[PDB]
Design a protein around this ligand. Structure first.
Ligand SMILES: CC(=O)Nc1cc(Nc2cc(Nc3cn(C)cn3)n3ncc(C#N)c3n2)ccc1C
Ligand SMILES: [Cl-]
Length: 329
């Protein structure tokens, strides 16, 4: 027993090599601004510990997104601030415009750049073979950047990908679950949306790294090119691994758990059983043939792997023939 240790293949000691101020977010001092400088316009939605609004900066009339941080620990507030500030000026990463507190309730809020988003449910239906490779390369620039900066996003999903299609502009948002990578640290597996959770989260292997975001991206890719959102549609965390297993096959799931000496949660051992690998070509039909190519299926196969150490890194993902000629490099 005892899980086998794992280290990130890239950007391993990146935080160990920067001063405390960089990654020791609890000790970071926040200079809170005023929310009274912002006029809220309409409610955009909510998170686990957040309420989101589209607002206006009174002084310059610019549209802005205001995320009120509902009862959370100030530890997590400071972590999101620190990640956003470290990643500012990064490609396809949302810009943190201000850090504020309400004058009356004193509740903290983060102010972001506004993106004129089209809901993925109406947008993906409209995307071309080129569009998908373009947007996928843009998500990867954002992921290679934050991974190179020592941060795991940990919640890569269509709702966290703001796309202004008309302007062909993409922003990776909600760095509210993002964490700093530290070699040999065991992270909380109760992160990400059910559908995009990596098998490491599902099997409860805590010593995961940057490669988690790579699995979620592969999930986003599958829903697009096959026109099936979400691609892996479990009704719970146990049924999620069952859906994955029915596609990737159990041979590799068991080789994975055996390799890292993962003690599966016992409820798994009653529902997992044995499944043969389903080839990606099985998901290819008449309606999505225009989005599919041998290189799309190869790229996808290299991301959707159980073994986190076997998935492509964001740099390798960008070097793939899937993106040849899509961008300059
Ligand atoms: C804020 C955050 O961390 N997560 C989040 C985000 C939203 N929603 C939007 C919508 C738009 N843009 C938008 C969409 N629409 C129809 C109009 N304008 N933008 N833009 C930039 C950003 C950012 N950051 C953002 N967020 C809802 C809920 C949550 C939890
Ligand atoms: Cl956490």
């Amino acid at each position: 027993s005892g899980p086998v240790p794992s280290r990130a293949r890239v950007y391993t000691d990146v935080n160990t090599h920067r001063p405390r101020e960089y990654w020791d977010y609890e000790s970071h001092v926040v200079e809170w601004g005023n929310q009274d400088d912002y006029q809220l316009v309409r409610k955009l939605g909510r998170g686990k510990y957040s309420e989101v609004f589209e607002a206006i900066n009174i002084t310059n009339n610019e549209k802005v997104v205001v995320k009120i941080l509902k009862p959370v620990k100030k530890k997590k507030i400071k972590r999101e601030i620190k990640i956003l500030e470290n990643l500012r000026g990064g490609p396809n990463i949302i810009t943190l415009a201000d850090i504020v507190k309400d004058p009356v309730s004193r509740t903290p809020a983060l102010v972001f750049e506004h993106v004129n988003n089209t809901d993925f449910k109406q947008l993906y239906q409209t995307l071309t073979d080129y569009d998908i490779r373009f947007y996928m390369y843009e998500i990867l620039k954002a992921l290679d950047y934050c991974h190179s900066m020592g941060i795991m996003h940990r919640d890569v999903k269509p709702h966290n990908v703001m796309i202004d299609h008309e302007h062909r502009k993409l922003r990776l948002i909600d760095w509210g679950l993002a964490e700093f990578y530290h070699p040999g640290q065991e992270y909380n597996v109760r992160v990400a949306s059910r559908y995009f959770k990596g098998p490491e989260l599902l099997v409860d292997y805590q010593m995961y790294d940057y490669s988690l975001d790579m699995w979620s991206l592969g999930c986003m890719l599958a829903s697009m090119i096959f026109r099936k959102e979400p691609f892996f549609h479990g009704h719970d965390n146990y049924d999620q691994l069952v859906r994955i297993a029915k596609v990737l096959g159990t041979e590799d799931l068991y080789d994975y758990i055996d390799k890292y000496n993962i003690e599966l949660d016992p409820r798994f051992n009653d529902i997992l059983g044995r499944h043969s690998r389903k080839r990606w070509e099985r998901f290819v039909h008449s309606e999505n043939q225009h989005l599919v190519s041998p290189e799309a299926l190869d790229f996808l196969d290299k991301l959707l792997r159980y073994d986190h150490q076997s998935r492509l890194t964001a740099r390798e993902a960008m070097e793939h023939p899937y993106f040849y000629t899509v961008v300059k490099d």
